[PDB]
Structure formats: structure tokens, C-alpha cells
A paper describes a structure:
We have resolved the structure of the ΦKZ nvRNAP initiating transcription from its cognate promoter, p119L, including previously disordered domains and regions. The addition of nucleic acids also revealed the structure of novel domains that were weakly-resolved in the ΦKZ nvRNAP apo-structure, including the clamp, the GP74 trigger loop insertion and the GP123 middle domain, equivalent to the bacterial β2 domain. We found that the trigger loop insertion of the ΦKZ nvRNAP was located next to the GP123 middle domain, enclosing the downstream dsDNA. The upstream dsDNA was not resolved to high enough local resolution to assign its sequence, however we were able to dock a dsDNA model tracing the phosphate backbone. The GP68 CTD exhibits the same architecture with and without nucleic acids and was in a position suitable to interact with the upstream DNA through two different interfaces. The first contact involved a disordered loop (415-427) that was placed in a similar position within the complex to the helix-turn-helix motif of σ factor. The second putative GP68-DNA contact involved an extended loop (445-460), which would contact the DNA in a more downstream region through its tip. The electrostatic potential and the amino acid composition of both the disordered loop and the extended loop (which are rich in positively charged and hydrophobic amino acids), supports a role of these two GP68 CTD regions in DNA binding.
Author numbering:
A (entry chain E): 2 to 191, 201 to 230, 247 to 252, 263 to 270, 273 to 315, 320 to 471, 484 to 542
B (entry chain C): 2 to 698
C (entry chain A): 1 to 486
D (entry chain D): 137 to 385, 532 to 548, 568 to 676
Amino acid sequence: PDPFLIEKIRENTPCMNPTLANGITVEHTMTRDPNTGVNMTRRYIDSLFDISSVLFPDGFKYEGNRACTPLKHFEEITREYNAKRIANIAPTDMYMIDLMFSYKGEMLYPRPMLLPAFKRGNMVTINGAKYIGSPVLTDVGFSVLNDSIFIPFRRTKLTFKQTDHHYMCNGQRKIMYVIWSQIHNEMAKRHIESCLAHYFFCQFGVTQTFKQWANVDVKCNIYSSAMVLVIPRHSIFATRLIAGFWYVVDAFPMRFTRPEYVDSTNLWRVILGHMVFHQGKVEENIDSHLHSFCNSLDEMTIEELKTVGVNVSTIWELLYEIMTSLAHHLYATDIDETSMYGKRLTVLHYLMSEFNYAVSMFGYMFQSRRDREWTVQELNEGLKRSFKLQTAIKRLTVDHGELDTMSNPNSSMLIKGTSILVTQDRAKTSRIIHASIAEVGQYKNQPKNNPDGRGRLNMYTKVGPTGLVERREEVREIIDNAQLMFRA
Amino acid sequence: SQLGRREIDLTLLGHTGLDPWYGTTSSARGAMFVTHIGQAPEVNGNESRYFLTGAELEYAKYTHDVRFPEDCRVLHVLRKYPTGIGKDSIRSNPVTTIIYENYFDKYKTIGVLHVPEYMSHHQDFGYELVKNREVWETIAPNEMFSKDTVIAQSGAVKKDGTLGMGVNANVVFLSAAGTIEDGFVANKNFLKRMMPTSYSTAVANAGRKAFFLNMYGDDKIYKPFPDIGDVIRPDGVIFAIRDHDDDLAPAEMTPRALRTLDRTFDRAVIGTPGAKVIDIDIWRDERVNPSPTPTGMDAQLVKYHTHLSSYYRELLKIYRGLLARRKDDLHITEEFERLIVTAQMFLPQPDNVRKLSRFYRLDPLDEWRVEVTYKAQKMPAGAFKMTDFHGGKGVICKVMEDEDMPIDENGNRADLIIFGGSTMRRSNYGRIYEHGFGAAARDLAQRLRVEAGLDRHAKPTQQQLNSVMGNTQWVDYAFKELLGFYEIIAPTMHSKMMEHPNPAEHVKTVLMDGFPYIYAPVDDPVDLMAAVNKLINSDKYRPHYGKVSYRDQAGKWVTTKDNVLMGPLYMMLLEKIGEDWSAAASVKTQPFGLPSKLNNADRASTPGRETAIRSFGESETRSYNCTVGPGPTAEILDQTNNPLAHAAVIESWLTAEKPSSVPVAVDREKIPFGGSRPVAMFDHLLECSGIALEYAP
Amino acid sequence: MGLYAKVVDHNEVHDQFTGKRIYANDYNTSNSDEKEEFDRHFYSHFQDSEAIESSVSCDCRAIEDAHKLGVICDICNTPVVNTSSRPIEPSMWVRTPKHVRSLINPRLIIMLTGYLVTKEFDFLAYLTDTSYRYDVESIGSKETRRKVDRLLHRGFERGLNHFIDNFNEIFQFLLDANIISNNKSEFAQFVAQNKDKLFPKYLPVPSKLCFVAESTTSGTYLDKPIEAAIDATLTFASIDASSVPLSPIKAQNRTMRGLRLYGQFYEIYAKSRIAQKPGLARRHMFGARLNATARAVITSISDPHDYDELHIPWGVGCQLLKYHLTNKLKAKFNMTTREAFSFVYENVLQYNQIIADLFKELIAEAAPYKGMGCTFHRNPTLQRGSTQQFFITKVKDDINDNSISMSVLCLKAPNADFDGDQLNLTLMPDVYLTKATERIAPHTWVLSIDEPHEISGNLELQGPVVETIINWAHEKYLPPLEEWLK
Amino acid sequence: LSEYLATLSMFDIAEVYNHPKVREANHNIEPTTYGIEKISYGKVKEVFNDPTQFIGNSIIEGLRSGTQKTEQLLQAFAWRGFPTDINSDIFKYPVTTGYIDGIWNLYENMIESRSGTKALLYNKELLRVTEYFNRKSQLIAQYVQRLHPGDCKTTILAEYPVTKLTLKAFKGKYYQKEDGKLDWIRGNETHLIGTKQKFRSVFGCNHPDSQGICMTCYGRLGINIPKGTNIGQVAAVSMGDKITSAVLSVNMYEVMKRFQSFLHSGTYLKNYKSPIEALPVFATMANEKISLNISHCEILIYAMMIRSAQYRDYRLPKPGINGQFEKYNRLMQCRSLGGAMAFEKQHEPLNNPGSFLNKMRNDHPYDLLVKGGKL
Ligand SMILES: [Zn+2]
Ligand SMILES: [Zn+2]
């Protein structure tokens, strides 16, 4: 071709986003800080232990992580057992780090741990096989599917649903929605479901519950079953509180023999435990359950909700906003399910899930054994019992939907490499049209798994530093006009 | 709709941006095209397309290659094998390893970079890495390089910046009988330009159980396997191993017996005959007292292991020197860290500590483990798959000599014959425009070639071009003719070409190439059928439209009654070339006595896959029981379910005067029905439970 | 006239058995010496993933020489037999323990378990095991509690020996009390006719081949449905291995527990291993992986040809016709079998003139047939046409083509296309099967099966050929007839 | 005819595209279903059907000979129309251009892409369901084995209504006309519509074979059947082939489920008391969606018949008018154990007390394979 022709063709062609084209998994896992020289994956490990420090007994600290020399790396994977040193020569892309802990100023035994390394093109070799690690497009903050608000925490996952109950106000029968969620798991191991107002009554007094949040001076407008509660003639949140109170009371009327006992705290906990699970064991058991519940809002989840605009600092503040500001999502959602604009490309949350599981269970062990003197030997045995050599990578090639076998007959990096996108539904092993597919996905690229074009990533997508999908203004009008005609 | 107006640009299309006529193709076919480009192996004759949308420039930026990740300084350069003139010398060095240092860094991280001769991300397809001569000849210790400097890359990435995804082929749309069911009729010379290359590795284990045979040596030299640079011997055997048995030494260990491979009783690994060995890796277990290998059978094994040990020993020495100088200040990349671990796994352990028991994914290594890498070039002929860039998938069903393919009145010879009727039934009309417009573009370049006095088909030389460029009036006239064609077929290209700084250079390039390359962006504001009508009614740019001549299937030279137009199409090869065929007359069974499945260890033990095929499922036996009849159907099953019946079949073939005309294979009087293992197991289990199935009296 | 089911007499099987009989009662697993011998007869053990390099053997693998076939081993007292054809027979037998009347046919237990066993109270254990415990209050269903009250009021004696001795009375009561609330007349007839073969004295342990133990570098692997069989066999062994001799009541209770375990095994094994999609019946009784078969992609024969002829590639021809070529090489060229096998395998991947001549001679010798008979299968198999009989008439001389060329006139019937369709080829071994498979010759699907006196649409020509014909027939190459007459 | 090969190029496209009437069916059109699919498409169909236009054109000559189809050609030379979304919902606005001109605006291009998405569906489930349905019907149908040529000379006829929908399905059936003589339906006896005729039927056969029928009762379609073929399998294959083709290419999946529930009795076949009353109901049901001959319909219904449910005689009745209907599951487990061992839940028939009682039973082709080939 004419050399002048190529220059004019090049001058008139926009360039792809190099971050997406070169591979975003590499950019999110192996990028090193210029100041300290520690990559993203190791920094993620530090953040995990920061949010879990509130469950640590006094004197126990996490000192960080260190890179292991190849000599120690070789010695650890060839440790002698039964007078035999097994060496696996199948190629792998792994490196080793040490986890440092201290107790009252005394350093404990370091725990070696293996982590995977990624190369250009989202390529990784595990046990002699080549794989591709693809990002997952996920909702930020919370997800809504069908009369349900899914909120993922680092240690828990909660779903909030709705039920309707009948209460009689001023002699008039009324219907109100009751929001409930299953927060204890032996309740699943087991009729009334755990109501949020019931949790409020378990924590605060009923009068305190109404005055502190609803600013309502409940007495003993008259509300009765279908015992009297009296409210001044001059809210929806208060109505939901009343509905939940009567929902709890109606199916457990024997417990409330005297009205004043409503304002207690132990009685509500006894009822909750009988729902979940002898009174003596039940009362003590929940007192720990409510203790762990009050510390379940980690710092990382708070920042995620802040981006959506929730602004919650304590777990009780979150429950208030679910009953007040996010209640309409249960019946009349204003968020388009088929959109792709307010989402984030996430890598580490799915890559480091098994390690995150170990960290959470380590913190729960301390909670289950509160008020106990810890010896150095006991702590060393506990650390060895949870953080093992292959804890993080033991299931990468088993049930991780973002890792797939590589088969590329040519040298191109884009066609089936860095352009693979994983939907949130298939993250761990369609929908109607939307104009955002033309900007974020590839609506004509239709593989069998994702025939709607949402299984591939547009290489010209605009992505923020943290992986948030941004909007392109130069195509805003044409995208908007099509969306109107799609729904017309 | 306002014909001639387009809104969608490259940023909204995705992979579809490679097609300049996406709007004229149905969505079902457009999806097929995007899938196809991900299944296309690199061919030897790849070249840039005649029509460019500009997306090829972007796709040529992101390919698997060898780069300097950051601004670094070269510390050491290592070679796996010492290519020289020594007693133990290797013809070529497969791998060069580079140790660098990020000197523009606070911690001065030290990394490693490998430079092989090929890459292979597919099971059986790869490509050669072409070294950049300027950078390669420079590389030496104490040299600084810039970030993102390419050392080697595939040959598809052209120097101009374009990408080679296929080969342009002359196509005539005809209804020849060889085009039935999406078949292609292919010129033999064209298939020589669509040859892929496959890279594969063979693994052998020897030691306490078996020893290598003398497959590549003579009466005075023992050479179990070919060296680097050799080729696989004609029958395809790379190496074979024989079991250890001392009492059979006067028989199995004579010099003649060590040269003869026994197919029934030995084990061999078979690859493509004529393939060239390019790399060898050997692992040895040195803490064996005494080694079970007989003397004189390890000269070749020791030669490669000794050089390999030196390569790993130097790597470990380099790290230890770095660790001594930079105590607690040494930072290394994750790739370098794993490399040092490999070196320690390879080198012998000190005598004070226990030896290593080496494994490869739960497979214990023996004394010797040999891995041989070879490359083969495939000639497409029959059953190969092809497609254009418009979803028109096809299969090569007939190959003709170059002299027999259709030829037009201007001397153009077709590379393919494709049935045109299927275009209307699939509505992929981008096929028509590339074919039709390319024919006009090709004829225009050839017309200017003849007007200048050159041969319309042969590539002109420098002397001829220099004389042609001497005349200025013709050069100016030629440029205007090219511009006039651009005005019709490509408006955006036409505006850019108005102000060419050197019009003579553009004309010279066209005459040399023999084709004017056309820039056709996806958002080109051109009415397609209005452009087609202009070309037909034009006295300048009307493509030649006449008869063609070819040799039919009866060997007769004929000429067509209708006018046939010849034009180019971008073609690409597809994977699954049908190399996984299976055929077996007798298969190895289980302890139960039924045919067994094939594992990877036995996959390459034969030139072709010898696996029993489940040709009679439950559904087939339902059909056979009704048409053929239950009687003969039971006979077919019993010839396999009963191993003794199968033994009778083989004996019948071997003892027959005419093995293909045996009256009866199994004598049912000598081997009556009732010997099938699955039925006997069924009866036995029911009998233990206390029941039996019987005919109703 | 169809197949029905019979009831076998186990003690008659015991009497007619040939060879030394091993009883699982005479084994104490606690003694490590006896455990090894027990595992010798029960499990078929494989010590690694290595191929068995032996054709014949005795029980204890002391003799692996094929020339000693039929000779009885002196260590295991077992004749040397050919593997893959070893007879399938019970590995052991179970005797009647002490102070026990007899055993029970496992078929009868399986039938009773279907009715008697319920979620809250089973009646078989109560009538047979004195150690079975129950709470009448805990029963939370009216029907079962009514049955329980009726049985308790009846006043039967719990115990296996009493259950066997008085079975007609107990069985009759179960019918009257509506315990067996289904097929009352059929069930009574079954028991009344087979009562002589429902209480055997010996029971056969399944064959050694059923229980396969594979020991690898990562442990020993076993089949879970086998569990009940192992437990049942060990239970009877422990009766005589107890340090303190068991009282007659405890002997019966352990015997019944063993019998209940046998019934569980046969039902679960039939449900999980005989009767499923990858089961014994549907995968091996009504299907098979045949010898002398090939599998490859297909192309077209567009040149003038016969509609029922087939062309196979060079590589398929060499491996498929290995013993046909070996027969010719030995006779014509005086090769040994070792040389012939070496010659054939050497030339699979390269052209050889001598092999090519033999291929034509094999095809020409199939007279009066056009070639070697074979059947071509296309999946899925629904209609007649997906399975057709062809004749191999040519082996392609180009080694780079690995496809089976098919006639263009027989592509519509199997709905076959060239896009990655691997078809299955089966070589007919003799003339008897060649005549038999004539019933699926291509001409057998010509006449339509949907409409009388009509030819199926499968016979219609392909698109490219039709376009050529209409381009010729409907051309305006003549003046109109009126002008022709002038 | 090697010199008369047909060819295609942009020259042929220009001929059809430049016709004045084709170019007028692309301008001044109401963007509605009526304006596009009826008026605009009607004009183009008129031009393509004129024998005096496009003489020698490769595209049009193929259309007249059936090589091409108007549905694809109209979407290429006329307006593309209204594509649907993945949920079969239509869009308010149409595609105002054909394929040859091209679709280059974001809205119409995107909605056109949904057709390709609709093309690729969960055919894996469709294959699984169709294969299961075909296997189930074939296993039970195989109990009717042989078709003998000749005439059994029966005085038992069958009274069936003849309608406009089932007249074509009666081809080859012998019916007794006036004066007591036999004639067979040629397919164009329009005067018989709305009447009732006496047919020679499978249910009236008196052939000695306990699992066979004569040619006259089957109809003239039996002439086409190859000799020695299982006649029951032919009926099941004919029904399965047409259903499978429609399902893979009201949903036909619901149609297949409807046929299955009716024949297997879970408006069920067991409700009816005589086969004569049940055939027109099934024939109308079958011929409304697919085209199934009456001979095939009679065989499928006949296979579900038993002699005496009270005495548990599950053999086929002879003649077929003296029998009753039974459910599929009970029949597959109580007719012959060989057939039972090949369907499902093979353990259950082994537990059935009735399997051990000496009874007269029909045989199944799978009986030989259960015994390994013994006789
Ligand atoms: Zn022995
Ligand atoms: Zn009849």
C-alpha cells in the first residue's frame, strides 16, 4: 500500500483504551506501587486484615506481609514428609509471601502463602495449563432482582424481602409491608421470619426504637391486633414499625402477658432465639449474635455504598435506610435491570474469595471464644490451622467462572483474550435489548453463552481508575435517542 | 433513510469494525464472521487486505510477542545450548534468556525475559517468532533499552503497520458440480500459499522399567532420538522403548534387535514424518546407585543433559551473587523468582540432605525424561475449511491443477470456484461488493500497466519502472484516472487523496503492486448501488465481463456461454483440519473383556488413533432391529461383546484365500451365542439377587 | 412369546457349583493373616495404573504362560484361564449361622421392604429384630399408627427363627390388616407358588469382577454403591469372629442385619448401575464399541460415479485393513508376520506403491460386489437413511486428504453436511452380513412413507446442478413456434 | 452441460435493482405492518411473477424454478420490516431499508441484530426433549411388527367423518362405496367432504398374525414400505420426523407435549371407549399442525390397546374393536420384560409380582439382545 495512504488512515482512526486492550486483570493484580514496590494483590491482603482487626483480642496484631526468597520458596514446596521430598516440575506461575503476626510484641511463626502471577493478555499458567482471567461486570453497592435487595459484605451476604401483614388502626383494618431477612443460618437449618423491626426491638427498647429513629412517643391514633399502642395524630416508617411489631406479637401472644414487658429487651431476644433455635442457652446465644451483628459493617462495604449515595456508618443506619429510602425497590424499582452503565469491572473480589473465606473464619474463631487468655502456643496452632500454603489457589481451576482454558490459534490478543467479559450471574459456577450494549459490549458478537452481546467487552469503553464504567459524551445523544425508541 | 448516510463509527461496532460492508450482511452471518476470526491459524502466505477500514492498524498493536516491559539495563545473556564446533555441539540454540534490571526504579527490581523461536497458545497450531534484527544484534550486557521495545514478533505484523489475517484469492461464482453443499474448488498453487504450521511436543520416560532403542543410529553409533535440526524419519517414529529383561539378552539385545522396532511388543511415540526438531529438554535423576541404564545407551542423553545443567547452574550462580551484594535490598520479579525455583529443582541436591522425588502432576518421573519439540508445515488438500470475511464458510472438496482452473480473456486465473446462489439465501451481500469492486479496481491497475508498456501480469522491475516514471504527462494522466475511480468507490479516501504530496509515488506503488489499495471506512457516505450503476455505465472503469475457459471433469477444454466476472475475496483458513481421524481393526480390552477408552499416554503410540468407535448406540440398535432385523443385529454386537468371537473373525481373514470375500466369519456351531460379557454380567447379578429372565413357555 | 421372570433356587446353584467353595463365615478379619486372604477372593485389586502385560493367569498370578492353559495352579488351586473370557461366578458363599433356621432370598426382602418400611415405623425389623426400638407416641400419622396398633394387638413373637417358621400366618395377617395395600391378589399368588424357593440355606456373594479396587498415588478408589455388599459380607464373618460366642438371639439379630444389607445392595445396584443412561443395560446390552470401525469427516463425490460407492482415505485404509493386507503380504511376498506388521505400520503416513496395488486387488476380489461392504451412520439416528450401506471401491492416493468421500445423491436422506460432521464407518466382515445389510441400501428410502404412490423429496437434485439445467433448458435459443412455421 | 454453468455478480444484482417498479416499492410507504408487508411487498411480488420480466437473469430464473424464495428476496430488495426482540416482542418502528442498500443507523441495525440472537437458542434442550419423545414412542410402537400383503376379507368396516382438513390424510384408504365395492381415496374426492364413509381399517383386521395386519386394512401406503420392515416403527418415525423438524426449525414444543399426553394417557386416549370414536379426534389434532396419514394414525392408536384390563391381558386385541386403552407406563412394564429392560427404572419391573406369573405375552425386538442372541 501507499505509505501516504497508511498515515491518512491512521490519522482518521480512533485508538482503543490500552488498559482494556493490554488486559485489565494484569492492571488490577500485578501493578506495583512506585513508592513501596508492593503489588495490588498484596495490598488487597493488607486491607482484608485491617477490617478484621476489630475482632482481634488485645495484643494480637497483623504486621504485614513480606516477599519470600526463591531459596525459601524452593524449601517450602519441597518439605520432607514420610522421608520423601516430592517436587512437582509442571510449570506454574506462582510466587510466595509470608504473613507476619505478633502477640504482645513477640513475633509468631510466619505463614508462607502462594499467589498467582498474570502476564500480558490476562494469561496465567497453572499446573502446566494455560488460562485466561477475565473481569466480571458487577453492581456497585447493592443489587435488585425481584422484590429483593442483595447487599454483599466481606463476611456476609444479605437479602431483604417483603411480606404483608394486617393490623387494625382506630377500628379500621389496614395492610402494610413487613421487611424481613434471614441473618442467622441455623434459622435456615430449621411461622415467622426475622423482621428488621424485631431486630430493632432486640437491640433497643420499643419506646427507644420509636423515639430514637421514628421520633414517635409510643404509649403502652390507636393500633390494635386483628394491648394498644397510641401515637399522636400528627409516618410510613412508623407504620412499618407498627406492622412488624404486630406481625411478631400476633403469632407469639403468650409471651406478652403484660404490656410493660414489651419495653424490655430480654423477651424480644427470647422470642428471636425460639424463632432461630431451652431459654437459658437461647438468651446467652443471641447476646453473642447481636454482638457480632453490630460489628458486621466493615469499612470496605461502607465506601462501596457511599458511591451509590447511601451514607451509612453503622449497621443500624443501614437497616433504617432500607426501611425508609430503599423500600420502593421491593415493589416499584426505578433502576433498569438491563442497563450496563452504573457497574464496575471487578477482579480481586472473585479471585481472592477462598482467601477471604479463611480470613473471615479466623476472625469468627476469636469472636466465638471471647474473654479468654491466649497462649503463644495456642495462637500458633490457630494460625497454622487456617492459613496454609495453598489456601488461596486451591480452587482456581475448579469453580472460578472468570478463569477459562486458553485456545488461540493465532497471535492476536484481543479476539478471545482481553475482550472476554463475565456476567455477574456466571461469576461462580438473557435479557432484553438496551442501548448501553453498543457502548460497553459488542451487540453483534454473539457467542452461544451470551447471545445478547453482553459476554464481550467493547475495547473503546471508558473506565475509571477503580474499574467504574463511565459514559462517553460524544455518543451520548445517539445512544439516548435509540433507547427511547426501544421502549416506545 | 437518506441513502448515502451512515451514523455508526468504529467505537460502537466491536470486532465487526473489520468489515467495510457490515450493513449489507444479515446478523446471523455477521456473528459467524466474528467467531471465525478467532479460529483462524496463521498461514505462510498471509498479507494485508485490499480494502481497509483502519481497524487493522489497532488490531496490529496487541499481539503476543517479546517485549521489554520497562526501561531496563541488560545484565546477563544466557544460551541454553552452546552452538559451536566442539565435540558436543548443537546446530542451533533454541532459547535465549535475558536478565535485566529496572534502573529507573527506587528498588532496582531484577527480572528475566525469555526469547524462544516460536509461540503456541493452541493445542496444535502456532507461529514463528521473527527476531527484530536491529534490536537483536545490539543486545549485550550493560545496554539500556526503552519501555515497550519489541525483540521478536509474528510475521503477520507487517512493517507498514497492517496485519495479515488472510490471503486474497481470485474468485469466480459458478455452479460447478464440485460446489455442492458449500464445497470449494481450489487451485493447487493457491493452497501452497495457505499452509499452516503446527508445533507439538513428545515425551518419553526411561529408567528402571525400560530402555531406549537405536532408532536414529547405525552399527557404530547409538542415537535414540534425532538431534536439534534433524528431521523425523519417514515412518514417523521419534523414539521407542523396550522392557528390561536380562534372560532375553542374547535375543533382544543383539545390535540388530536394537535397531528393529516391534510394533506389537514395544512402545513408540509417533509424530509427523519430515518434521524438524527444534528443542529438547532432559531431566535426569542422578542419585541412583547403580543406574539401571545399560552402558553405551546414554551418550546422546548425557550430551543434552550436561549442557542443560550448565545453563541452570549459571542461573543459580547469578542469583546468589546478587543476594550477597544486596542483602535485604534485592527485589526480583515473580517470573525470576519462579525461574530460580526451577533451577534448584533441576540441579542435584547436596549429599547431606534427602534427594528429590520429581513428579509431573501426580506422575512420578523415572531416571530419564525427554521432551522433544518439532514443527511441521501442513499442505491443505481436501476436507480443509475456508471462509471469506462475510460468513461464507466452505470446505475444500476438489483440487485442480493450475492449468485447469478457469481463466478469463485477460489472462486472470481463478483461485477458487464458489456457488453464488447461496448468497441470496443467506443475504451476505458484502460478498458481492468486495468481489464486484475488487474486479474493477484490479482491471484499472492492469490497464495502466499495459498503457505504460509493461506486462499486465509479471511484476515490473526497477529499470522498467524508472523508464516509465520518466514521462510526466502519462504519470499525471494516470493519477487522475486513479482519483476518478476513488470518487466513485470511496468518497472519504478520495478527499484525502486530492492533496497527495507526491502523486508520482502513488502511481509507482500501484503499478508495482498491481492493485490500488482502497480505504473504506465503516461510516463512508456512499450509496452502494449508485456506485455499482456508475461502474457498469462507465467507459473507463467498467470491469471486463466476458466468457471463461476451463477443463471440465471429463478432461475437455470448454468455454462458458455466459459472461463470468472474476474478482478477489479475502479468505482465511479455519481450524479442525480433520487430523483426528480414527481407524482400528482390533483394539486392546479391559480385564472385563470389553474395548477400552484411550488415554493421552496411548494417543501417540500409533500413527493414527486406534480406538473402538461406538457406532451402535441404543438408538441405532432400535433402527437396525426394525429394518435389518433382530437376527443379524445380534450377530454384529456379539462379534465384539464376545472376545472369542472377535478372535474368530481375525483368524477367518488371515486364513482366507480371498480375505475380502469370506462367506461366513464366525462359525456359530463352534462358537454359539451366549458368550457376551455384558449379558453374562447381567444374568449373574440378577441370579445373585434371586431372579432370572426366561422365555415364556 | 416374550420374556418373563423366574425365581432361582440358591441351594440348587450351590449343589451344582464346581470347584472348592469358600465361605465368608470362616474368616476373622481381626487376624491380619486372614484379612489378606479374604481380600484376595473378594476384591479385584489393581496396584497401579500400569497396563497388564499378561494374557492368561491363575487366581494368584503365579502362572502367566499361555502354553500352560488348563493346568491347575498348585498355590491357588485354580485352573489357568484366559483373561477377558474368565467365567463370571460367585466369589464366595454364605452359610447359615449357628442357632439360625435358614436364610432369606434377597428378592423377597426387597419386595417386602417396598411395603413394610415407612418413614415412622417399619414392620420387617419389628417382626425380625428383637433389638429394634420404637415409640408409639412419636408416630405422627393416622394410617401408620392404626397399622401399628393392629399389629401390636395381634401379639406376634419377634425373632428371625419365629418369622421363618410361621410365615404363612404372618403374611396372611399383613394382607388382612391392609399392611400391604397394593396388588394383594398378585402378591399372594407369587408367594403361594414360589414358597419353596424363598428360604435358602446358602447365598452367593457376587463375583470378584463386580468389586474393583484401584490403588493409586492418591489413595484407593472404590465404587460407592458397592458399600452395602461389603458390609453384608463382613457382618456374617463377624459372627464366628466374636471373642464371646453370641447368644442365639444375638445371632439372629446380626443375621437379619446382614440380610437387610444384601437387599439394600441389590436394589441400589440395579437402580444406580444397571438402570440408568450410562448403565449396563442401555450402554452395553443394547450398544457396543465395535471392532473394525473408522470415524472421519466427509466430502463429496461430484465426478461421474455410482451412487452407492465410497472412497476412504489412505490412513484409514491402512489401519482398518491391517489383517487383509497382512494376508496378502505373507502370500505374495513371503513376508513373516512380524515383517508384514512392520511394513503396514511403517507406511500408514506415507504412500507406497506395493500397498496401493494390494488395495486394488482387495477391492477387485470382492466380486460380484462392487467393493467391500460397509455401513455409514449419521447421528442422531431417526429415519431410515441415517444408516446406509455402501461399498468401498477406492482408497485415495493422496495422504493429505483425511475425509471419506460420499456420493452427492445420498446426502439428503441422512441430512448430512460438510461442516464438522464426523460419521461412523463399520466394515462388514463377511458376505453373510453384507447380504443382511442390503436392507438399508440407499434405494430403500426412495419411496415416500408419508404419501402413497409418491417418491420422497430426498431424491431431488442439489441446487448447483439444477441451476445449470434450467440455464440450458429454458434459454430462449429458438424463435417462437408461430415464427418457426413462418 | 459443462458450458451452461450459472453465475452471479453485481451485474445480475443491478438488473433486478434498477427495474422501475422495484424502485417504486421502496418510496412513499406508510411505516406500518399493512403498508410494508402487503402494499410494498405486493408490488414486488407482482414484478417477480411476470414471465416477461428478467429473462435470463440468474437470480430470477432460480426463483421461478424454486432455487430461491421470495421471503429472503423481499427483505433484500424491499423494506426489511419489523424484527422482534428475544422475548418475541415487536418494535414500534420498522427497518426502512433492504439488505442490498444496507442498514447503517444505530436503532435499526441494533434491532436487526436481535434476529441473529433469536437464531441461536437452547437447541440443546430441544434436542434432549425431541430425542426422549422419539425414543418413547418408538419403543411402544414396535409391538405392531408385520404387514402382510393381500386381503383378509373382513366384514368389519369403520365409519369415519371426512372433512376439508383430513381429506388429504385419507389417501390410499380403501372405502366401501355404493353397490358394495371397494375403492381407494385419490385425494381429490371433494364430494365426500361432510359425509361419513365405511373404511377398511386396522381395527377391523382378522389376519391370523397376533401382531400383524393385512395390506387392504392398512391402505395403499403400505405398497411403499420395504419388505420386512417393522410397521410400528414406520408410524412412529413418520410422526417423529415431522415434529422434530418443526420443533428445531403456538410453539411446536407445546404441540409435541399435547400429542404425548393424549396417546400415553398422561382429553386422553383412555377416556374413549372405542378406537373408532378416537381416531377422528386424533386425526384432526395431528393434521392441524403436521401432515400425518390416517394409516399412521391408526397404527399409533392401535399400539395402546389391550385385550382385557380386568384379567391383565395386555396383548394386542384381534380384531382391534374388542379392546380397551391403557396408560403408557403400565404397558411398557407389563407386556414383555425385554421391552421393559430398555426404557427406564429397570429395577421396578423386577419387583413386580405380576412379572413372575405365567401369562400370554407379546414379544419385542429387544428380546433377543436381552438373551444375548440365544433362542
Ligand atoms: Zn496361582
Ligand atoms: Zn385386514
